[PDB]
Amino acid sequence: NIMMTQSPSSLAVSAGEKVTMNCKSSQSVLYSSNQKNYLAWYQQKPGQSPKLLIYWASTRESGVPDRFTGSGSGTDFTLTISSVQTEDLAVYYCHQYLSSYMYTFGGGTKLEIKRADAAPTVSIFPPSSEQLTSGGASVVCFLNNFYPKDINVKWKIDGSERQNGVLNSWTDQDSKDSTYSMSSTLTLTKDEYERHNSYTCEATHKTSTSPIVKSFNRN
């Protein structure tokens, strides 16, 4: 088995900058009879299947832009993007297709787009009527359109920070603005919810030394 190793696992790059991603095979993928490297590069854009970019380690596929360049021989290979475009946001995988061997893929390099720092737009939502009707009570916080991905959310119930029953989910980078979004959900029973009055969610982000605070009272 030829092990394909890709480095780095992910990298952030601004539009118009040069990008280099590495691939390493556990053994030579150079043929010697052909004198060709049986290495391919695929690009997988969000929500899509992979698309072939490079074959024979250096030759570009049909509709592949000139900015994409493959190099290396034997065990060490690289994929280079000369003028990074927002459209080039994808996971890039290397693949060995050596005749006598089982097909293998690298773990992929996630290329993320660097943008200006942006603060989140915070929104708080009390449990719905129909949810309370069923015995449950979920308080939701949306932290929308922020950059970078690192953010902290603390939930406060009547001034006390709560650390039981919260689930946080991040969106992938936007196709249009390169930002992230996150949804934080505090789940309590209808009884636990009715026992308290003030519900607060505080967001801390690189953009401000001050938390963005959103709250509501059950009245």
């Binding site: 992979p50 072939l52 693949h95 893929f105 129909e130 949810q131 069923s134 969106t171 789940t187």
Partner: protein, 218 residues
């Protein structure tokens, strides 16, 4: 125009069987070898099986050999994957690929990939979701909380697709052996609540479509 259309993906109990199909068009299907490649939740790409142009030569990795069967029908322009003794580690997006090299001759890697069919191998039962509107208690953020469904996926649309470039779909998380996800829309203060905003949730797995109108409070 090369087109590879997979179908057959479903929720299967561990130890079960499932047959995947791939309808090919826009190329002489019978002159190419086809392959199946799966993508697991960790996003890793894993070669599953390959069959020569004619269906004479078959190749499998150790992970699948004995359990899976690749086949094709050159008269129907279809590729098949019969899966049996299914295990949870078989849960993935299954792609139908086309071997780049013409017939026997080597040197060209797989070039066209289809859109995939997802296969879930789990002892967990199909549960329809509960949809809860998220309304506040220049712009206004509205949402929908879609809780306690199995399996993935659900499809949330706002105003039946009329809304918007301003939608966020938050990836589902497994909570108590069931999935929970959320969606948000941002509309101008002038449009809501003056004009009707509804989220439509469909879970094809449970044959469920649920439309929730978002209403103001106080």
């Amino acid at each position: 125009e090369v087109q590879l259309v997979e179908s057959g993906g479903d929720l299967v109990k561990p130890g079960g069987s499932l047959k995947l199909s791939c309808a090919a068009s826009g190329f002489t299907f019978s002159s190419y070898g086809m392959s199946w490649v799966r993508q697991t939740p960790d996003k890793r790409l894993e070669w599953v099986a390959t069959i020569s142009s004619g269906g004479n030569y078959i190749y499998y990795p150790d992970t699948v050999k004995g359990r899976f069967t690749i086949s094709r029908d050159n008269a129907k322009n279809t590729l098949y994957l019969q899966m049996s003794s299914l295990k949870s580690e078989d849960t993935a997006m299954y792609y139908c690929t086309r071997e780049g090299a013409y017939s026997g001759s080597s040197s060209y890697p797989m070039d066209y990939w289809g859109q995939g069919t997802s296969v879930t191998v789990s002892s967990a039962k199909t549960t329809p979701p509960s949809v809860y509107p998220l309304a506040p208690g220049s712009s206004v953020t509205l949402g929908c909380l879609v809780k306690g469904y199995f399996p993935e996926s659900v499809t949330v649309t706002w105003n039946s697709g009329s809304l918007s470039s301003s939608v966020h779909t938050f990836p589902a998380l497994l909570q108590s052996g069931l999935y929970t996800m959320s969606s948000s829309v941002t509309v101008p203060s002038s449009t809501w609540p003056s004009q009707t905003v509804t989220c439509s949730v469909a879970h094809p797995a449970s044959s469920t479509t649920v439309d929730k109108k978002l209403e103001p409070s106080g």
